[PDB]
Structure 1
Amino acid sequence: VAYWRQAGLSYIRYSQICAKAVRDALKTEFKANAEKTSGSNVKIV
């Protein structure tokens, strides 16, 4: 029982945050391309 699960999160959120952290710490050479390949366009209705 990790701390964030005690806070009410979900591993999907954990994974999003971690992937975003690795994408931001990416060099500007690869940063735009990597961010493109993981951008979210879906919209809830």
Structure 2
Amino acid sequence: APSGPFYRVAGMSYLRYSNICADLLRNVLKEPFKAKAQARQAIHFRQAPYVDGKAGASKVYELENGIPKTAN
């Protein structure tokens, strides 16, 4: 449906593609460096939309591996 590069036409944003490439470069690094490159890879946060002003459901991220390779 969109018109762009191979990540953009698939619905993916650019930041997810570039972080997927960063994650796959990180997974093949040297062992004096791969463990400390796991520090810059963890995604731990949460979010919650707010529709009416204070109500909204929660969405929690616990990801130590990196960005989700699966669809957003």
- TM exceeds 0.5? yes
- Please name the residue that 2:60 is paired with: none
In the alignment, what sits opposite 2:29? Answer: 26
TM-score of the superposition, structure 1-length normalised? 0.78
More helix by share: 1
What runs of 5+ residues in structure 1 fail to find an aligned partner?
Answer: none
Larger RCO, structures 1/2 (Cα 8 Å, 6+ apart): 2
Kindly tell me the number of residue pairs found equivalent between the two proteins.
45
Q: Name whichever structure is richer in strand by fraction.
A: 2
Larger radius of gyration: 2
Matched, 1:15 2:18: yes
Runs of 4+ in 1 over 6 A off after TM superposition: none
Deviation per CA, 1:2-44: give whole Å up to 9, x if none.
Answer: 1121111001111110110111011122111111123111122
TM-score w.r.t. the length of structure 2 is 0.55
The share of aligned pairs that are identical, in percent, is 40
RMSD, aligned α-carbons: 1.2
SS across alignment from 1:4: coil
